[PDB]
Symmetry: D2
Subunit: 501 residues, 4 copies
């Protein structure tokens, strides 16, 4: 097996304690005589019980519930005019990758078929380091101010007094006028793509703009699109609810079983690109996470194919302990000034250090096995397991040699020129229609081409908001009316039948 | 004038002026503005308020309990209604009519934090009493027995009730592989109860609580007795059936949490009646089973219930995380005149739970308000320091027994256990299933003498098993069929016929 | 005081950690009189397990230190400069906590080691806790924040041998790009590198900060706390002897003088400068390795700080104290000094690891005069204050929330930045600009203190004598850029101690 | 290099961040323009700084300060009649080992030459698992009640208010009447052996009695003695103090440099053995840690030789993270009912799980490389780095093969028969003279043979207790007077000169 996905099991099958001493009876415990009280000196018992007390680590916040598989990305098209990263430098080049799929709001034991965005995070083990594309299955998101993220997530989870989901706080936050820029993602969430039929039947999107540069120093704004080679397939609200009770692990079973039998799912990787000149002529901001780039003006360009063909050997070791961050990147790939993206560069490594520990990059699944770590000044820390570079100095000693490559490759100094004071900005919902037009285009130009999808959207909102108090229901109705008056009336009618006044 | 304070175990401190601040008390002048260069340049490192918010968010979660991760809680009291001072000298019993405050956490066992309230499972029913002699915890399930009588089998047993280490899914094969392994079949009594309709109660208000183990209670004259605790619901037993439980798992995974909270919030306070069984050392040597065996009950006819008091739950928690998630129970948390018996499962629990608390919550978890013994404050000169020491650490108190200071050790003439059993022998025992029928007979008595009197319950037991084992491979299925036939041939045939109809060969 | 007190049972009844009384201090349960021990002795395991958890990770750096409580009293009106509440009234007193420390030594190392001293101050104001996280020098060794882990490593133990190491110490400091450290190195190897006690040293902001008034004008600021007990220093031999004979020499001095009523005090001053004055300087106000000469930027008095209360419990109040330059109040902001900018991140992050995520609920760290209220900051291990009860954990439109000072600017009224996102390594400048102030110390300051010029050379010589000859030669060359004679004095003494 | 002591460093020397991406400038940090404020998007800076903030772990409590070296034990004599452990089964057999030397009371940055017992802990990496001999450089200790350990250690450390060593509490605890059984170890501590000249010049002792069995089922009470082949050498009080100031790392330096130049230090391993019948007849208890077995009745028997010949490559990775416990044992070696030892079986694994992490046995220096761990039910936990047994079931699946060897070898059921109720016992200092006589034998029969030692002991106590208040000083004089009146007069005379009275 691969070093990122293997184990070592004694071939003699001799059972031992945690110090390698053999156990001569699996279950006998020491006491006085046959039935006296237990003796403190029973090391083997306390060893087992104490480790059992420490099996659990803190769940992710959010995206606690999820599934993973290994695979590779194959390059099928030459895009070196856009991006100089090694993983792209040769048509036919394969890079190993790890994917973790997840829901968002649910805790570890929640159901696969809950309504939620799904995470679709990808770790590529390249020769220039491990690069993570920490993506969802939607090209947009609920917010464009990162300070709102904890608030939003709190309202998607449990009430702090009652410990239950709460439609009142769910929609209270979404209808606050400064927050209504979430309406694009809300439409997507309550369409039937909020309950995918399996992880094999969904897409992955960068969501944010990134900046990709070539080896000549030209660069572009980039959007990433991973389209499923299995086709889009969705559940309806009632199929999702029924499966939740009858099989909370439906999507994990689908993924694992299809890989185990050889029905490996695949995706086609495309990108959108945009020049700095094109970006300034836009009627919206390339830094706005709630906006998409229209396909007609910015067509998709093919790059390669991703295949998942390898199940994890141990879920905890390879999936639960997997760590992804957007700030894990490679030369020639950078983040844009999207403020949500900027905040994620800090948040994820900080989360990993708490959830997994300071030396989490030494966990095999997280190791950059194709670009070994060598930093003299990153040393020690609990559970340092790889030798801590031995007697290497912990500073840049003039008695030693150190190679700093790509000294002439700019990072971001060749890109935008910023100007202004240090300025606090609350990017509240803009006036006029700009923050609603893409929601209307989704309804009028996309869902209309799908039989019955406009109605399913209304039904999916109605049954959810029907739990909210009347004044909140009314705010929800008014917000959707800004998108389409008929959509608003369909929600109102169904919602009111389920909750009369 | 000052207002009414909430109880110290269940309260909060919120600025009257509603001024929003950061984690260091400085005011925030705009809730969501973040600093960048210009209007839309990249974010600046110097935005303390953003990073403060985001790093604390990253640390909201602590590891879930293992097991019993999912649950609910409420506060109430135990009121003593009868004089049992002849049995037990503890302060909590020393006066008829006296109330001790308590916290109850109800839980399932196998499911993770976000699993369904209505899953089939034993339910935990843990009680913390804040007495004048310290906090005493009664860490009980809603059944009088359990799956094991060897403590070393607990990690193994719990693993097979949870997820497969490769596929991350519940696995009927390993569930039943463990329970039908010959040395483990002493679990059959508890399995019968698990697979009856009591395995899916209609709400926490409609189930019982049992010590499960034998404990030892002593009076002030030095006499002692073996004791079993029974808390019987005054609302009555009410159960869901398997299909009702499954459908609710999908439509309302928090069904029992909602029921407890809403009934308390509206004043429909649930209560239970507290009883004990008692036995002398002479009687226990005459029994055909062991009082140290967790898989056995004491028959009511020979050991009738004796009333003690009434427990009422009448106060919801103000903050679920602060009072329920951080609550810490242990059977080794006890008071004078109540002790554990040599039940080997109970003995291991004395060690396990304080150790889990120290990892899950922190070494100073007894300083969290819900866990503090507010009616008997801690004073130990040698227990000092540690992370998140928040109560002053005894200030300048010497950290040993200094001859210049006064230290009072009360109850010096009260024995701990040296007045009870006399042990004899050298220092390892695997208490595997016994030969013959002793480990199957109480399961048969439940089937034939108890469930037979409840219309439809014998049929529902076979159904609940059949639908569960139908997912297992045939070799495991046949072992399951055979084990149940040791209880009753007809129960076995019913399970088999239905299981095979669900998974024909 | 809430930051410095405890609660001890008045009946003196000894109990376990759950409040149950212990009926014998030391008896342990076993079979018979001398059989093996029983698992069921909760009282033994309770004590033994908590003992195993007494220790938390030491600070990195500044692990070794001492603390006291006191107050700052305002004696002058500086509201023209700063509108903070703690300054708004002459005669106003704010409670404070001070932690003194060394830098490189671990817990248990000697008080009298040669080192900078930390002199960190926490103020408990009505607008929040503001920390002035200062050293006893107005400068420091680096002006690139990325070099801090490297520098601190070379000041501590070799990763193979676990010993202090003159070779890595001086290798790093003589690396051309790093020689901007020369100013602090002069200061470190003067006798002020071994103060006679914490009462006999100063405190300096080191960095430039930005202070604003209620009218919206602002100034660059340097803070100076000058000891009213006078400067008193040890020499290298005195400090060494005390390291062996009383490694707690300075902790003993502070505690006993406070206990007997000889309360130490300091006089608080500031220097101020406008953006225009700063643009004309031959150096940068963002450079930590530079000072503002007193004649062009005279000191202005503000008030007095007094320490008059020892902690009741060292661990609870000193070891657990959390200071950060990012703990600030309205009208005090950090400057674009790149070292200071990085410190705004580092200290909260260290606190969350060293102390725990809810470390601000520890009494000494609690803003007792401006209690915390943030709906979105909840849960976390050892949440001990009720977690705001049933308050929503977001901004519910059914509740009220007051955001005060909405029209008070943060930094948007100050400098206008311009440029791309630029990686910058602020390496040592060519020419003399990064050496002239070191030379000014030697020729204009130490020359007026009899024997201090010789003592500096002696202090360097005895230290570098352990370094290999090539490192020795780089050290001699580096000091020769400051002064020829200084270099020659060092060289004579070093070569006599390590002949070739 | 050996797997317990090696590293992996990129042969191209390319410097990277913690995710393996190359760094193209060692110290440049991103800001707006040349001197604007720093940008949050500089992952490399925060990566370095946040890992710096997590370098430290809690120090050991106690024995925080120490030094370590690797080596081997060679068996030179046949003791299979006493012990059946694999590490003894063949003359000439070598087992690799790790030793950590330490002081007791001082923190990490304290001085090597402090007055203290020295820890001398040995981890052996055998074919039957890792077995640890967690010894001090003295054959006795201050206590025989385990509940007293936190109290005792607290009084040896800093005062909780002043944060200073405190002779009043130091001696208050030791002169408390129930605690005076500490006198034997106190005499040893304040002899000049309380300040060894180096780790190479001291011995190691089990202190406790252990129980060792042979493959035929016979067993013996056993004491282990590791005697230095370099000879005992000590500092005196004034030399140790001066070195504390001039080189707080004197003993670490001595060990490291002597190993690096080929002057490998060694020890000769001996054991004492005693049958159950002989222990019934002793005037003291083999379960008493404050008692030794006199050589004349129980001579030493040679076993082998230990050599330390390999320095650690990285102090933190191999020394600071090393985890020792007396409950880490192998077949045929078991602990006695010595109550102090019994408590240690619990304390050390509990400490390790806090200080290092639940999966600390996967840190290379603590791994049993000669007996890989295989336990299906021990799984997951933070920083599980060895693959976690892959898809192996986490219980004893009836579909797999599991081998339990040595099923017919007893653990302890072949040894003592205990009897009685669960009894709380405080093993306070006994009345009469039994807990003082061995301390007197040290003074009169041992220290007398070393010129000036008897006076050096009085001096070492005097200079220490002179800081104590007069009420406490008098208690100390009276306690030593129980040992020898001239000794007590000598201590009193010098202490009163250093602290005169009214
Ligand atoms: Cl722990
Ligand atoms: Cl952390
Ligand atoms: K987008
Ligand atoms: K029972
Ligand atoms: K400065
Ligand atoms: K001994």
């Amino acid at each position: 097996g691969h070093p990122t996905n293997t184990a070592d099991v004694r071939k003699d099958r001799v059972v031992t304690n945690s110090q390698g001493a053999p156990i001569n009876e699996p279950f006998a415990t020491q006491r006085v005589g046959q039935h006296g009280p237990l003796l403190l000196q029973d090391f083997n018992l306390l060893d087992s019980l104490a480790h059992f007390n420490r099996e659990r680590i803190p769940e992710r916040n959010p995206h606690a519930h999820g599934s993973g598989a290994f695979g590779y990305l194959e390059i099928t098209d030459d895009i070196t005019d856009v991006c100089g990263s090694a993983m792209f430098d040769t048509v036919g080049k394969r890079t190993r990758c790890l994917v973790r799929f997840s829901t968002v709001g649910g805790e570890k034991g929640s159901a696969d078929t809950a309504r939620d965005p799904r995470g679709f995070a990808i770790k590529f083990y390249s020769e220039e380091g491990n690069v993570d594309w920490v993506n969802n299955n939607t090209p947009v998101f609920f917010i464009r101010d990162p300070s709102k993220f904890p608030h939003f997530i709190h309202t998607q989870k449990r009430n702090p007094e009652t410990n239950m989901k709460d439609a009142d706080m769910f929609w209270d936050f979404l209808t606050t006028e400064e927050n209504q820029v979430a309406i694009h993602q809300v439409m997507i969430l309550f369409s039937d793509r909020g309950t995918p039929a399996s992880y094999r039947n969904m897409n992955s999107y960068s969501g944010h703009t990134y900046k990709w540069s070539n080896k000549q120093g030209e660069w572009r704004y980039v959007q990433v699109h991973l389209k499923t080679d299995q086709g889009i397939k969705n559940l309806n609200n009632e199929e999702a609810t029924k499966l939740a009770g009858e099989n909370p692990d439906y999507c994990q079973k689908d993924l694992f079983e299809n890989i185990a039998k050889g029905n490996y799912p695949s995706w086609t990787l495309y990108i959108q690109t945009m020049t700095e000149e094109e970006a300034e002529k836009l009627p919206f901001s390339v830094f706005d996470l709630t906006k998409v780039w229209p396909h007609k003006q910015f067509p998709l360009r093919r790059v390669g194919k991703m295949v998942l063909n390898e199940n994890p050997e141990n879920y905890f070791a390879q999936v639960e302990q997997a760590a992804f961050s957007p700030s894990h990147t490679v030369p020639y790939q950078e983040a844009s000034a999207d403020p949500v993206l900027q905040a994620r560069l800090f948040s994820y490594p900080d989360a990993h250090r708490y959830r997994l520990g300071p030396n989490y990059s030494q966990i095999p699944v997280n190791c950059p096995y194709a670009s070994k770590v060598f930093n003299p000044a990153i040393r020690d820390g609990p559970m340092n397991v790889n030798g801590n570079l031995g007697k290497e100095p912990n500073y840049l000693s003039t008695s030693k040699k150190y190679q700093f490559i790509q000294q002439s490759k700019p990072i971001q100094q060749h890109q935008e020129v910023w100007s202004g004071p240090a300025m606090p900005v609350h990017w509240a919902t803009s006036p006029g229609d700009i923050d609603f037009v893409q929601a209307r285009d989704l309804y009028n130009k996309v869902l209309s081409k799908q039989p019955g999808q406009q109605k399913a959207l209304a039904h999916n909102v109605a049954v959810h908001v029907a739990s909210a108090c009347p004044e909140i229901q009314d705010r929800v109705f008014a917000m959707f009316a800004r998108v389409d008056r008929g959509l608003s009336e369909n929600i109102k009618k169904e919602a009111l039948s389920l909750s009369p006044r």
